[PDB]
């Protein structure tokens, strides 16, 4: 028992992280086979970053302008090209530690592990959710661009996120590994705001099931509700609508605990209207929405990865 | 910016994890050089576990009784021996992925990363604190024994924890890597209770500094307090006493923010007496005590590891 915000083991990704330096700028690259992936704004300088033209900037670069450092080994760039907001640097060495991998774009409400890196060297690992407004609440300092987010499915690493920037509210924005930003953001220093966020209802309910599986039952009740009457209560509290598909995904957790999904909704309704009256759920005094139904089943059952 | 509960990159430890099977019992081992370390209760069976005699049980075992599995390679045991509550299995192969390492015993109030493992395969990584009562609030299922806790100092892995058991309150107990339990626990199935816990005051204050560094200032105030008058308030709220040494450790965070340690204490005093009035600090509605001053300086400055 117990429930922790738990990241994937980071070793498979640690072996892909490199340092990319171009001019004054140093950030992180992702080295897979003979390509290093990094954020295209590495080719910028501080006055380039106001409103740059990256196509113009890139034709001006030379292969030898990109210093790619894999630990204490320098990698020879033999080709560069832009793909949306990422750079693909072709190097003269395939990464011998390339895991089996995929580039996947996630949906808001889904989670992933982030390997925060600086100068090509991993600093820490932690779990994040893609918020409804397409930001993530990360932990990122200058130099962390090119850190990646990922999930692991048996032996296969699905890269979903590359870090690019911090918004003025302290939340973070980036791209998938094809270079396409999550959300309405651009890799330019202009007035960009996150946009209003909502709480991920299905994750809150999955986390209530985690808590029941782990002994926390005080918030349960005999009442029930219709999906329609719950969703009226969701709108009022800036919770996202609950669909029949969400109810389905929560079926295994319903079966395991014997608490009908709509019954848990009635519990959520009362927690929303009454608060928690000084009590805690799984050691939190807030309703937690960054655990998926998958995350709960994975942790409360013991799945591993090879 | 941002502040996340952040684990160390787990790759160096993933390469040490193996599967140890003896009779009916399978758990995890830690393979360093030519020794696999695992919890001694692997030699038990279900009726052995009521009140076993491990010395008696071990003389009855044979080297070939221990099946040690490193991924899909079987390791030949050529020697076994007991050290307190751990077994040291000598194998005929040094682990080529042995990082530079140390066995260190931590103090309550200190943190470490846990690599949860099942059948020798890492499942997830997360950050834990050693509680004042010598338990940790982990996430551990049957089969997770032999998972280890660790910190990384540049390139060197300091192993501090081996998992052994869950107490009836759902908290976890284990040993250092020399086999010595943290706290008054034994690797026997008898009536064992955690014992009353306290909140780690110095960590709460370090986390308040993290929050100030990250923009959360609402809880600050012009008042101050003496260390003596704060510690009266600590006892009342089951917080642990604050020493002059704690005040010293918090000096760099004091210097950085310009908030005198004793001033932050005055803020903590009011949060304890008044609560948080529906507000949050770093996205938590509780006072958080599982971040050390070190953890805060590390995350809010960007230290990495090679
Ligand atoms: C890349 O290492 C870096 C990561 C961010 C630094 C601080 N926290 C981070 O996550 N990215 C950048 O520095 C961005 C570069 C551009 C805009 C070219 C993508 N810049 C920002 O993140 C940035 C600049 C700002 C100015 C004013 C307010 C907020 C800002 N964010
Ligand atoms: C080792 O894989 C396992 C890990 C725990 C299983 C459930 N969560 C865990 O962390 N350890 C054990 O199974 C312990 C074996 C002994 C006692 C020999 C060290 N047993 C327990 O943790 C255990 C048995 C209990 C019985 C009744 C209440 C609580 C118990 N904990």
Numbering used by the authors:
A (entry chain A), B (entry chain A): 1 to 306
List passages from the publication reporting this PDB structure.
SARS-CoV-2, the COVID-19 pathogen, relies on its main protease (MPro) for replication and pathogenesis. MPro is a demonstrated target for the development of antivirals for SARS-CoV-2. MPro is a cysteine protease that uses four binding pockets, S1, S2, S4, and S1′–3′, in the active site to engage P1, P2, P4 and P1′–3′ residues in a protein substrate for binding. Our results indicated that MPro has a flexible S2 pocket to accommodate inhibitors with a large P2 residue and revealed that dipeptidyl inhibitors with a large P2 spiro residue such as (S)-2-azaspirononane-3-carboxylate and (S)-2-azaspirodecane-3-carboxylate have favorable characteristics.
Because the N-terminal group of MPI1 is similar to that in most Group A compounds, we chose to conduct X-ray crystallography analysis of MPro bound with MPI48 and MPI49 in Group A because both have an N-terminal group not based on CBZ. For MPro-MPI48, the structure was determined with a resolution of 1.85 Å. The electron density at the active site of MPro-MPI48 clearly showed the bound inhibitor and allowed the unambiguous refinement of all nonhydrogen atoms. There was continuous electron density that connected the thiolate of MPro C145 with the P1 Cα atom of MPI48, indicating a covalent bond formation. The electron density around the P1 Cα of MPI48 allowed the refinement of a hemithioacetal hydroxyl group that had an S confirmation and pointed exactly at the anion hole with a hydrogen bond distance to three backbone α-amines from MPro residues G143, S144, and C145. The P2 t-butyl group fit neatly to the S2 pocket and was in close distance to side chains of H41, M165, and E189. In MPro-MPI48, there was also no strong electron density at this region to allow refining its structure, indicating a high structural flexibility of aa45–51. MPI48 has an N-terminal 1H-indole-2-carbonyl (e) group. It used its carbonyl oxygen and indole nitrogen to form a hydrogen bond with the E166 α-amine and α-carbonyl oxygen, respectively. The hydrogen bond between the MPI48 indole nitrogen and the E166 α-carbonyl oxygen is unique to MPI48 and other dipeptidyl inhibitors with an N-terminal 1H-indole-2-carbonyl (e) group or analogue.
